[PDB]
UniProtKB/Swiss-Prot annotation, chain A:
Species name: Mycobacterium tuberculosis (strain ATCC 25618 / H37Rv)
Gene that specifies this protein: ddl
SUPFAM superfamilies assigned to the protein according to its UniProt record, in alphabetical order: Glutathione synthetase ATP-binding domain-like (SSF56059), PreATP-grasp domain (SSF52440)
Binding locations of ATP: 139-194
GO cellular component terms attached to this protein's record: cytosol; plasma membrane
Protein name: D-alanine--D-alanine ligase
Occurrences of domain ATP-grasp (ranges): 111-318
Top-rank EC class of the record's enzyme: ligase
From Swiss-Prot, chain B:
Organism (species): Mycobacterium tuberculosis (strain ATCC 25618 / H37Rv)
Keyword Acetylation: no
Name this protein carries in UniProt: D-alanine--D-alanine ligase
Cofactor stoichiometry and binding remark: Binds 2 magnesium or manganese ions per subunit.
Gene: ddl
PROSITE patterns assigned: ATP_GRASP, DALA_DALA_LIGASE_1, DALA_DALA_LIGASE_2
Length: 323, 298
């Protein structure tokens, strides 16, 4: 119709193509006028069968649409790069935004903001150069083992399981190869539960039914060493959606997810990664770039909550246009 | 000679002016820029305006100042109070309203008390701000603020003597706090309040300044220490002006400004001059420090 919202699904020339495919097939063509844009390795915007200084082809594409639906993923994982371009071009797009993503990308800032709002996070310390060592009081507070990680990074690169304090220095140097700022986290374990948060056009935040992942077979309990996304790629992962959990606890966790979203001033969407510990729920991650394949955890959780993919996608578009 | 570029609402033009005349020419090659009068050809940039940061970050060029996240935090009243309270620093009570919510919960009212100041969470503290002395006035105040920012902060009024402190990042990474500077508008001794932001009050003709502030030594020392911690609490770089109110219950932090005025008569340069650091030395130091750090993750 001559009234349909015009949408560009923009993705990188694998998961990104499959995600783009999933989005393309589930956008209601009665409602949206949709085109498909692949970004070449070199960074040119090339149109593909949908079934200031901007990149080659990007100018012409952007003027022809009202909203961009970007696939924030690349060969190395989550990739929010394009968000900055779109912010600069003044084009509305589905995404958490530059600022929330920068926050979400930094474990220190994320944990700081979460805790500031009274949300449960695992105990940890932060080491900046030259600091490669911890105070005795910090050691007692953290216990062992600790997981040493670059504050900013992905896919669990530069991450070490430290099992005696003597191992810390080497672990810090390893993490420091990737980020000068290094986080020493108390190990967290229990059941790993996900919750997807969705922002409605009026700002109302809705939380999905919980999804559970298990990748530790014999051990019976998950821990926070690997990130959820990495675990999700394990051939041995088992997912329960919905997760089999007390209704009261599920409700409490969903409320926490909502609060986590607000805590970092997120926009649009996020996946919140919880561990159900002996001492209760702990937030291990809030991820601002959830997956968009039809078998990704975010869409599955929402489907289990009664919200089909076409409705989910339409809502995200409606929310970003309202904003 | 280190090549330097100064980029620059209306106070940005003036600031940029002082900087040009004061950068030791024998030490630096300088290029002023709103536009001439790309590249590169420059080894450091001195931003005096405005995202501008993220752009320079994306350019891999070293620049003076807090930059991306820290800049965002200092501009966001909610983020500021969050992160400050995180490190155990004293801030005023507040509540935040995000759409679709406009009405405070009873527990928020309980904690806030009256009067409160309603403000857009972002931007200056001049536009869309209201003083609310009774709850029935709150809805209209929120509607006013929300015209300027969807996120609205409701703040307990803070009152007392207003004191500023400039933090400076040295090349070796140590942080130094300037002597205190006091400001007074309004008729009284205390009776300064957190309604308007420092910057606005600093432009008022009525404004009286004491630099150094006449304050007890133990109190001044503690405030300067709180200022260092505030700077670190938001992961700031290079410099900041921290705005305090000395209340009946002790100092309270109201603002961390990551882009203070840079005229020779601005508060930040004034505080440092009163601390034994003249304007030329201050600027050279800032350039020194930013060369020594980046670019890259920090």
């Amino acid at each position: 119709r001559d009234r349909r919202v015009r949408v560009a699904v923009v993705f990188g020339g694998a998961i990104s193509c499959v995600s783009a495919g999933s989005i393309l097939r589930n956008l209601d063509s009665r409602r949206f006028d949709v085109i498909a844009v692949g970004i070449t390795p070199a960074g040119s915007w090339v149109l593909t069968d949908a079934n200031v200084s901007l990149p080659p082809g990007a100018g012409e594409v952007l003027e022809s649409v009202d909203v961009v639906f970007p696939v924030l993923h690349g060969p190395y994982g989550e990739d929010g790069t394009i968000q900055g371009l779109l912010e600069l071009a003044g084009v509305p797009y589905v995404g958490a935004g530059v600022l929330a993503s920068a926050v979400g990308m930094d474990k220190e800032f994320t944990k700081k903001l979460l805790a500031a709002d009274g949300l449960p996070v695992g105990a940890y310390a932060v080491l900046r150069p030259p600091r490669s060592t911890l105070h005795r009081q910090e050691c007692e507070r953290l216990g062992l083992p600790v997981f040493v990680k670059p504050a900013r990074g992905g896919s669990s690169i530069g991450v070490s399981r430290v099992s005696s304090w003597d191992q810390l220095p080497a672990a810090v140097a390893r993490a420091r190869r990737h980020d000068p700022k290094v986080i020493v986290e108390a190990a967290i374990s229990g059941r790993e539960l996900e919750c997807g948060v969705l922002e409605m056009p009026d700002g109302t935040l809705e939380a999905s039914t919980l999804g559970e992942i298990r990748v530790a077979g014999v051990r019976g309990r998950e821990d926070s060493f690997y990130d959820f996304a990495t675990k999700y790629l394990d051939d041995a992962a088992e997912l329960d959606v919905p997760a089999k959990v007390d209704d009261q606890v599920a409700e409490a966790i969903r409320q926490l997810a909502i609060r986590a979203f607000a805590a970092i001033d997120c926009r649009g969407l996020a996946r919140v990664d919880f561990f159900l510990t002996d001492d209760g729920p702990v937030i291990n991650e809030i991820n601002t770039m959830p997956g968009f394949t039809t078998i990704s955890m975010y869409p599955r959780m929402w489907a289990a909550s009664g919200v089909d993919y076409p409705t989910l996608l339409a809502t995200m578009i409606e929310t970003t246009l309202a904003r």
